[PDB]
Design an enzyme around this catalytic site. Structure first.
Site, short mmCIF file in Angstrom:
data_model
loop_
_atom_site.label_atom_id
_atom_site.label_comp_id
_atom_site.label_asym_id
_atom_site.label_seq_id
_atom_site.Cartn_x
_atom_site.Cartn_y
_atom_site.Cartn_z
N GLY A 85 31.05 47.87 81.52
CA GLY A 85 31.97 47.78 82.64
C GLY A 85 31.80 48.93 83.60
O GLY A 85 31.04 49.87 83.38
N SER A 86 32.55 48.85 84.69
CA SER A 86 32.52 49.83 85.76
C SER A 86 33.92 49.90 86.35
O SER A 86 34.65 48.90 86.34
CB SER A 86 31.49 49.43 86.83
OG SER A 86 31.54 50.34 87.92
N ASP A 144 39.93 53.80 69.38
CA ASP A 144 39.06 54.58 70.28
C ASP A 144 39.78 55.82 70.81
O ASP A 144 39.47 56.32 71.91
CB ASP A 144 38.59 53.70 71.47
CG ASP A 144 37.98 52.38 71.02
OD1 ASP A 144 37.16 52.44 70.07
OD2 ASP A 144 38.35 51.27 71.55
C1 LIG Z 1 39.88 59.54 88.71
C2 LIG Z 1 39.87 58.31 87.83
O1 LIG Z 1 38.85 57.94 87.29
N1 LIG Z 1 41.14 57.65 87.76
C3 LIG Z 1 41.47 56.45 87.04
C4 LIG Z 1 40.54 55.77 86.34
C5 LIG Z 1 40.96 54.66 85.67
O2 LIG Z 1 40.06 53.88 84.97
C6 LIG Z 1 40.54 53.04 83.96
C7 LIG Z 1 41.11 53.57 82.82
C8 LIG Z 1 41.54 52.75 81.81
C9 LIG Z 1 41.40 51.38 81.97
C10 LIG Z 1 40.80 50.82 83.07
C11 LIG Z 1 40.38 51.66 84.10
C12 LIG Z 1 40.75 49.30 82.93
C13 LIG Z 1 41.27 49.00 81.58
N2 LIG Z 1 41.72 50.30 81.03
C14 LIG Z 1 42.33 50.49 79.78
O3 LIG Z 1 42.73 51.60 79.44
N3 LIG Z 1 42.44 49.30 79.04
C15 LIG Z 1 43.06 49.30 77.70
C16 LIG Z 1 42.59 48.34 76.83
C17 LIG Z 1 43.12 48.26 75.56
C18 LIG Z 1 44.13 49.14 75.14
C19 LIG Z 1 44.67 49.03 73.68
N4 LIG Z 1 43.70 48.39 72.74
C20 LIG Z 1 44.38 47.93 71.52
C21 LIG Z 1 43.26 47.32 70.65
N5 LIG Z 1 42.12 48.19 70.42
C22 LIG Z 1 41.11 47.61 69.52
C23 LIG Z 1 41.48 48.65 71.65
C24 LIG Z 1 42.59 49.28 72.55
C25 LIG Z 1 44.60 50.11 76.05
C26 LIG Z 1 45.68 51.12 75.63
F1 LIG Z 1 45.14 52.00 74.77
F2 LIG Z 1 46.67 50.52 75.05
F3 LIG Z 1 46.19 51.79 76.70
C27 LIG Z 1 44.08 50.21 77.34
N6 LIG Z 1 42.17 54.23 85.72
C28 LIG Z 1 43.09 54.91 86.44
N7 LIG Z 1 42.73 55.99 87.11
#
Ligand SMILES: CC(=O)Nc1cc(Oc2ccc3c(c2)CCN3C(=O)Nc2ccc(CN3CCN(C)CC3)c(C(F)(F)F)c2)ncn1
Length: 274
Positions: A24-25, A138
């Site tokens: 992904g990106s 993770d």
């Molecule tokens: C400067 C800069 O780069 N700023 C940013 C960057 C940025 O990039 C991101 C950061 C995180 C995420 C994304 C984009 C898209 C998806 N994402 C993300 O954390 N998804 C996520 C997926 C599964 C799970 C929970 N699962 C449960 C099951 N498990 C097996 C896996 C995890 C979780 C959690 F852990 F619950 F929060 C989160 N977002 C905001 N600001």
């Protein structure tokens, strides 16, 4: 079925690129329905929408739709671009990026009080995830994000430094992942926080196992080391009481590990006792 979220909430023609963030990106965009204004958002794209990868991405979106907590990254919606033949995930934008980067780039505004604040917030996000019956797998500072100097939020970038150095022994040997192995990984996150000042878990484990080793031999030696009480050392300047929290999380006896509720309370009591 139907669309996974409202296909008119983020129209592709109004989602304007600002910056690449990670590959992904993820990209920074501005949603400007509408005059060069609108909210700034983070946007995740999938490289290859195979049957499997798109399945996985839908599952990720369904997980995020169900999570609302101050210390969990904030879902905003989805964008169906390419004429609704592609899917992108829309999130809150957090300016300071990953906690791993923040600790390296902003040491000037980090002290032990802040590290314990972040520690507490991570424990509370993990308490919440456990009520939703999710296992993170993770947990690592590369997957925690920084909103500002007083607030972090757990996420999972999922764009792909080996993750094996955060895994509990039973995860390495039996592929058993649980709340209790998230607690083990949390112990590694706490170590990362207090090393922030050649100290990383991969570098420290590789020094203990033998820096010249390659391939599966590394895994074999890591498992054997952990099964017989080999552990990351106490970081320079880390209080004995905080290293003791690490070591209690790193118990090979799964059921003897503390809970996230136990850990949040202990950490907030240590912070409050100053
Ligand atoms: C400067 C800069 O780069 N700023 C940013 C960057 C940025 O990039 C991101 C950061 C995180 C995420 C994304 C984009 C898209 C998806 N994402 C993300 O954390 N998804 C996520 C997926 C599964 C799970 C929970 N699962 C449960 C099951 N498990 C097996 C896996 C995890 C979780 C959690 F852990 F619950 F929060 C989160 N977002 C905001 N600001």
């Amino acid at each position: 079925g139907a669309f996974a979220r409202d296909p008119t909430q983020f129209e592709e023609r109004h989602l304007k690129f600002l910056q690449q963030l990670g590959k992904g990106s993820v990209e920074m965009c501005r949603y400007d329905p509408l005059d060069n204004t609108g909210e700034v958002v983070a946007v995740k794209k999938l490289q290859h929408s195979t049957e499997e990868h798109l399945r996985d991405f839908e599952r990720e979106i369904e997980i995020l739709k169900s999570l609302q907590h101050d210390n969990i990254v904030k879902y905003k919606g989805v964008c169906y671009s390419a004429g609704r033949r592609n899917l992108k995930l829309i999130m809150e934008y957090l300016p300071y990026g990953s906690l791993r980067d923040y600790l390296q780039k902003h040491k000037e505004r980090i002290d032990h009080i802040k590290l314990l604040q972040y520690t507490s917030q991570i424990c509370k996000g993990m308490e919440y995830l456990g009520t939703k019956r999710y296992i993170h797998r993770d947990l690592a500072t590369r997957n925690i994000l920084v909103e500002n100097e007083n607030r972090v939020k757990i996420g999972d970038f999922g764009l792909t430094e080996s993750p094996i150095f955060w895994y509990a022994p039973e995860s390495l040997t039996e592929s058993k992942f649980s709340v209790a192995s998230d607690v083990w990984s949390f112990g590694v996150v706490l170590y990362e926080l207090f090393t922030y000042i050649s100290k990383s878990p991969p570098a420290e484990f590789m020094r203990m196992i033998g820096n010249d080793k390659q391939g599966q031999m590394i895994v074999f030696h890591l498992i054997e080391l952990l099964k017989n009480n080999g552990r990351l050392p106490r970081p320079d300047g880390c209080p004995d009481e905080i290293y003791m929290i690490m070591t209690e999380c790193w118990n090979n006896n799964v059921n003897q590990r503390p809970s996230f509720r136990d850990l949040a309370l202990r950490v907030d009591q240590i912070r409050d006792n100053m």
